[PDB]
Design an enzyme around this catalytic site. Structure first.
Site, PDB file in Angstrom:
ATOM      1  N   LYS A  68     -47.138 -23.554 -38.783  1.00 47.53           N
ATOM      2  CA  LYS A  68     -46.853 -22.246 -38.196  1.00 47.53           C
ATOM      3  C   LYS A  68     -47.148 -21.120 -39.179  1.00 47.53           C
ATOM      4  CE  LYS A  68     -42.838 -21.967 -36.470  1.00 47.53           C
ATOM      5  NZ  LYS A  68     -41.365 -21.824 -36.565  1.00 47.53           N
TER       6      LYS A  68
ATOM      7  N   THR B 179     -48.905 -21.236 -41.911  1.00 49.52           N
ATOM      8  CA  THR B 179     -50.327 -21.253 -42.233  1.00 49.52           C
ATOM      9  C   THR B 179     -51.127 -20.452 -41.213  1.00 49.52           C
ATOM     10  OG1 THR B 179     -49.991 -23.450 -43.191  1.00 49.52           O
ATOM     11  CG2 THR B 179     -52.259 -22.749 -42.786  1.00 49.52           C
TER      12      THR B 179
ATOM     13  N   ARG C 100     -40.776 -14.729 -44.523  1.00 48.88           N
ATOM     14  CA  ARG C 100     -39.450 -14.921 -45.092  1.00 48.88           C
ATOM     15  C   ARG C 100     -39.533 -15.389 -46.541  1.00 48.88           C
ATOM     16  NH1 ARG C 100     -37.283 -19.134 -40.787  1.00 48.88           N
ATOM     17  NH2 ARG C 100     -39.497 -19.717 -40.964  1.00 48.88           N
TER      18      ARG C 100
ATOM     19  N   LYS D 141     -38.804 -30.871 -54.189  1.00 54.49           N
ATOM     20  CA  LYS D 141     -39.982 -30.169 -54.692  1.00 54.49           C
ATOM     21  C   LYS D 141     -40.233 -28.873 -53.930  1.00 54.49           C
ATOM     22  CE  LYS D 141     -42.973 -33.493 -55.282  1.00 54.49           C
ATOM     23  NZ  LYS D 141     -42.218 -34.378 -56.209  1.00 54.49           N
TER      24      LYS D 141
ATOM     25  N   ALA E 212     -32.286 -20.741 -38.912  1.00 55.70           N
ATOM     26  CA  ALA E 212     -32.764 -20.550 -37.549  1.00 55.70           C
ATOM     27  C   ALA E 212     -31.843 -21.165 -36.503  1.00 55.70           C
ATOM     28  CB  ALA E 212     -34.179 -21.118 -37.395  1.00 55.70           C
TER      29      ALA E 212
ATOM     30  N   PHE F 293     -38.518 -22.802 -36.410  1.00 57.39           N
ATOM     31  CA  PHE F 293     -38.011 -23.888 -35.569  1.00 57.39           C
ATOM     32  C   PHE F 293     -38.578 -23.896 -34.147  1.00 57.39           C
ATOM     33  CE2 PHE F 293     -33.820 -25.149 -37.872  1.00 57.39           C
ATOM     34  CZ  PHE F 293     -34.582 -25.830 -38.802  1.00 57.39           C
TER      35      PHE F 293
ATOM     36  N   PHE G  32     -57.592 -30.665 -36.271  1.00 61.96           N
ATOM     37  CA  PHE G  32     -57.728 -31.749 -37.229  1.00 61.96           C
ATOM     38  C   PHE G  32     -59.060 -32.465 -37.025  1.00 61.96           C
ATOM     39  CE2 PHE G  32     -53.663 -32.593 -39.488  1.00 61.96           C
ATOM     40  CZ  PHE G  32     -52.951 -31.520 -38.980  1.00 61.96           C
TER      41      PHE G  32
ATOM     42  N   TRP H 272     -56.565 -23.300 -42.300  1.00 66.01           N
ATOM     43  CA  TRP H 272     -56.109 -24.103 -43.427  1.00 66.01           C
ATOM     44  C   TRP H 272     -57.268 -24.504 -44.332  1.00 66.01           C
ATOM     45  CZ3 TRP H 272     -57.261 -29.150 -44.779  1.00 66.01           C
ATOM     46  CH2 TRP H 272     -56.485 -29.690 -45.809  1.00 66.01           C
TER      47      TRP H 272
END
Ligand SMILES: COc1ccc2cc3[n+](cc2c1OC)CCc1cc2c(cc1-3)OCO2
Ligand SMILES: COc1ccc2cc3[n+](cc2c1OC)CCc1cc2c(cc1-3)OCO2
Ligand SMILES: COc1ccc2cc3[n+](cc2c1OC)CCc1cc2c(cc1-3)OCO2
Ligand SMILES: COc1ccc2cc3[n+](cc2c1OC)CCc1cc2c(cc1-3)OCO2
Ligand code: PRO
Ligand code: PRO
Ligand code: PRO
Ligand code: PRO
Ligand code: PRO
Ligand code: PRO
Ligand code: PRO
Ligand code: PRO
Ligand code: PRO
Lengths: 559, 557
Positions: B71, B73, B94, B105, B273, B301, B382, B410
């Protein structure tokens, strides 16, 4: 009638230069500086490795035992630094960063006072450049990883009852002094007793100020002892693989913060540990930075000469490999008359008899600086208009008998102009000075021998007594291998003794040690003579109730 | 052909932030620098400039699946694409919470060649906003306990204290504590707890304030406890909100940052959210619409949670209206809704793509037929997506009157978003003002709940426990029945049952608890358990984090 100016009015009406110009005064290019607005900046610690050291002189400012009369230690530091600037010297002031917590209990304050301040005053009292937040985050990450290890496997065999690490927050919250956490379901941790200190009391803060570089910071943080195992051996942050992450949180904070005085003199504020359970000095990295970029560095230590100066010389100067060229011992006539038995209400009347009773407090601190550490010193009397000529003459008489001159400081009302007299004597001590610096004790001595040396030489005690449990704790620290570290005596600051009621120069007393523990990360052993408040509370009417913000985002009520 | 996100971030050439500010007509005197790549924007700039009245582009998604949808991205990518088209655009996003970085990580703001830089600084302290939020939260807690310890003239019932402390760590140890122990001078003994800082109501109130004045006022309305008479005790009753707004005075300034392609970006705020609305701050979105012609923002979300709350909460309190909605999805995620296991998502499965497509179709119907906002489906393509799979999705979506644009931001940067950006520009010029809320402020709490459950989730209705009814009843008496409702349910499903994928039909919503966020301005409603303080893993990611002799961090990503 009246007419007067509060410190915030002096700070508001100031004309602060762009911090880039302040940086230019110490040969700092724009590519060596991270700006935080146009009045704050962070200095890359990698400028040391690519520039030539000016090998500046070090001027340590201290004071007599603190009194309700006030002595104006930090005001004199800023003022003397401004004076040296008036004299055409290349000088930097090195100071600590205030904690934010107390601002909301008892209101905030100026860096110095009068016309000897550091600006921006508001930012310095609040978030500044975020160092306090970085300290606390690193402190609390180690705490979460400690509890997490015990919850997951506890393969280190940590005994929960011997966990010494405490969480921290930058607020005055008595509620968090003694807590029990880990309650709830099986998945909610392991139930044990815990507690919160104020962030500046965290050992992270102490090691942060005693690290020469980011690699030494990572090494010091790994040496922190967070608990003991069931076999009685220490468990460290390194054992939890935490020190690398803690150094990552502190990577930017370890850069010293560049600001300025009201007179445009370059100032560096960095670090600020306690002066009882820690050494009470600004960071080594900032003091080293200043001596590398300037010819003179005026720094200071908290709580007066019997504590701050003692730990500046026996802890900081040892770990940093530096030597003060001169020492400024600050005092006021009112504070000395207070030591002589005068109540706080009556400190404005002349009292030659009480001034003479309290003078041995100033005399003892002179003897310690000039005869134990063998450092040239000058007494700086912050003069008040009610100081009679006989009062000043009496102080000067007894100080001349020890070989120390007395210079009258009026920096609080006259800025750097009021510090020329103190500045001139300091330059005279630097040129006529020799390298006779001696530590108070040797590191090879035992913890009790080091304490005995400090109590007798510095405090004037006949000796040191230990409780049953203190002897046990010191014996464990010797067995575990910590007997070769400096000792940090956490006692009252209002007296040379451990009894806060013994003013002047108490004699024929003994120090009572009741508790001892190891600050392996900072590199010293902490020894207690009583209870130590590591988390202040809020008053009945907190100062926060008067703090307000207007529609344009201007803050009122802070000072 | 390329490397990880951190490697893309390192190989990037970010412009000086002053030049980024020049693109949105911000002078040097409107900007506080935090290094030459970050900057805070004075919120008073709105009071000395003419608003460009920029358009608002909301980015949402289908229900989060383990396949991922990308989202953020897409938001960054479409923002870069509008920049390639010569449009003056700002991406509003945000700020991430620093806590989880030491557990699982860190990660990029975005991904691939649609990122926001500095990635490292954004993941950690950034400009200190999270520290201010926690400071304000913890000051109110200290003053609340102090009042009870001093006099308790407000007759606060400690067993009715709702305020909780916070810390920006994943520390399960601090979920349930007992504080106030010790001497008589060490406080009042009571049970208490900590949340992660971004779960504080201070964070939600921070993000639903139009200016520093509303922030102080909202903070004052925060309910911290109840007296023995059952009446709410607020932060204004403690005289705390003026001090809390002082702690947040600099934090409330939005943070100016840039993308990989030099597009100006604003990152400000980061609430949950589920127990909050999951949007960036109102000031950040207002600032963007004031300084630019197009603003791309997002909500967390998926549409049933973030987009619902963006439209019924944030849009109501800010007085804004989205000109277009981007619904992001992937063929992998839809086939997951169709019953395909996570490990079999790479094979073509048109039958399962048709079984999972009703999820995307329900979100389209909510955006276009309940809120009446123009929408476009953005498929993050993809390599193994067959032309037949893409054609089926295009087919079913066009039955609802919504074009499907293929996104490749992307792997291609802003070039990969031209197709999406073009349909967004087409939707703005051809669109009309038909935006409607899902419910009205006048309705009761259970009516507002029944409106969301039926219209948005597709439920037959809402069921309430005995305790839920008493709490809702008490909230009506105290005068909170006029606020919006912030439904805290699972994000993995349209229902409150995380296992019901696709488009469930015969379900009802179960409400177990209702609380009041008077400072943010909404009533929170629970359908289950909500984790406000996650735990550290067995092997925390912080063990791999390190620093070299020159102060270079490794192991963060
Ligand atoms: C923070 O340190 C302070 C704080 C406050 C201080 C206030 C004053 N002085 C030093 C101060 C100082 O330095 C010792 C000395 C000069 C003076 C003349 C005055 C007066 C107050 C003071 O009232 C009327 O005439
Ligand atoms: C110029 O006047 C001077 C100059 C130098 C002086 C040096 C010392 N004293 C007075 C001095 C004095 O006043 C008479 C007092 C006793 C003393 C003990 C010490 C020491 C130095 C001194 O080093 C270690 O133990
Ligand atoms: C000195 O004045 C004080 C100071 C402190 C006080 C604390 C409390 N009360 C009066 C106080 C008071 O008024 C008499 C009564 C309400 C109450 C409920 C509680 C509690 C403490 C208190 O702990 C758990 O539940
Ligand atoms: C108006 O009704 C009241 C009013 C005041 C009340 C105050 C208290 N309690 C019931 C109350 C009640 O019951 C309904 C019971 C719990 C409690 C613990 C305390 C305390 C006061 C009280 O002081 C210290 O610890
Ligand atoms: O823990 C280690 O392996 C090293 C020692 C000092 C810094 N880190
Ligand atoms: O000369 C001195 O005493 C100090 C020591 C470090 C460099 N300058
Ligand atoms: O007294 C000592 O042992 C060291 C020598 C240089 C300064 N201090
Ligand atoms: O009131 C408190 O909690 C602490 C102890 C006495 C002074 N401040
Ligand atoms: O976004 C960043 O800041 C990373 C870390 C330093 C180089 N690139
Ligand atoms: O009045 C009370 O009850 C608390 C305890 C000492 C002063 N404040
Ligand atoms: O605050 C104090 O000192 C008293 C003594 C024990 C209980 N509370
Ligand atoms: O809510 C406010 O902003 C003011 C502050 C005191 C009471 N009313
Ligand atoms: O508390 C948590 O969130 C994790 C999940 C199981 C172990 N601890």
């Amino acid at each position: 009638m009246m007419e007067f100016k509060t410190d915030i009015e002096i700070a508001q009406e100031a004309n602060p230069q762009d911090i880039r110009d302040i940086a230019k005064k110490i040969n700092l290019s724009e590519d060596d500086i991270e700006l935080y607005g146009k009045y704050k900046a962070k200095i890359d610690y990698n400028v040391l490795n690519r520039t030539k050291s000016r090998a500046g002189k070090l001027i340590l400012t201290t004071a007599i035992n603190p009194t309700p009369a006030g002595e104006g230690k930090t005001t004199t530091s800023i003022g003397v630094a401004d004076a040296l600037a008036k004299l055409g010297k290349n000088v930097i002031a090195a100071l600590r960063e205030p904690s934010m917590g107390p601002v909301f209990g008892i209101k905030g304050g100026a860096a110095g006072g009068g016309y000897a301040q550091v600006v921006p005053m508001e930012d310095i009292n609040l978030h500044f450049t975020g160092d306090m937040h970085a300290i606390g985050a690193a402190n609390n990450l180690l705490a979460a990883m400690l509890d997490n290890h015990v919850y997951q496997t506890n393969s280190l065999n940590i005994n929960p009852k011997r966990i010494t690490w405490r969480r921290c927050v930058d607020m005055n919250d008595r509620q968090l002094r003694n807590v029990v956490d880990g309650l709830g379901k099986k998945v909610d941790g392991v139930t044990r007793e815990d507690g919160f200190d104020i962030t500046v009391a965290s050992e992270v803060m102490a090691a942060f100020c005693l690290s020469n570089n980011i690699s030494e910071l990572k090494e010091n943080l790994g040496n922190i002892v967070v608990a003991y195992n069931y076999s009685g051996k220490p468990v460290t942050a390194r054992d939890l693989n935490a020190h690398g992450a803690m150094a990552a949180i502190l990577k930017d904070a370890l850069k010293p913060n560049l600001v300025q005085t009201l007179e445009g003199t370059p100032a560096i504020l960095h670090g600020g540990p306690f002066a009882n359970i820690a050494h009470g000095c600004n960071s080594i990295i900032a003091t080293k930075m200043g001596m590398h970029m300037a010819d003179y560095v005026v720094t200071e230590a908290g709580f007066g000469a019997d504590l701050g100066a003692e730990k500046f010389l026996d802890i900081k100067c040892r770990k940093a490999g530096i030597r003060p060229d001169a020492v400024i011992i600050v005092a006021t006539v009112r504070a000395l008359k207070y030591n002589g038995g005068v109540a706080k209400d009556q400190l404005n009347n002349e009292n030659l008899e009480a001034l003479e009773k309290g003078l041995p407090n100033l005399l003892k601190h002179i003897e310690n600086i000039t005869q134990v550490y063998k450092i040239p010193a000058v007494v700086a009397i912050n003069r008040f208009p009610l100081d009679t000529d006989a009062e000043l003459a009496l102080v000067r008489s007894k100080c001349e008998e020890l070989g120390v001159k007395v210079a009258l400081s009026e920096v609080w009302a006259n800025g750097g102009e009021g510090g020329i007299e103190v500045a001139n004597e300091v330059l005279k001590l630097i040129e006529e000075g020799e390298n006779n610096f001696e530590y108070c004790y040797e590191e090879d001595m035992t913890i009790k021998e080091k304490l005995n040396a400090i109590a007798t030489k510095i405090y004037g005690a006949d000796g040191v007594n230990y409780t049953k449990e203190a002897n046990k704790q010191i014996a464990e620290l010797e067995e575990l291998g910590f007997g070769n570290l400096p000792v940090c005596v956490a006692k009252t600051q209002y007296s040379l003794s451990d009894d806060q009621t013994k003013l002047g120069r108490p004699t024929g007393f003994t120090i009572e040690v009741r508790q001892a523990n190891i600050s392996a990360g900072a590199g010293f052993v902490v020894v207690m003579t009583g209870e130590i408040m590591k988390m202040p509370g809020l008053p009945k009417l907190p100062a926060a109730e008067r703090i307000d913000v207007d529609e344009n985002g201007k803050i009122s009520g802070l000072f």
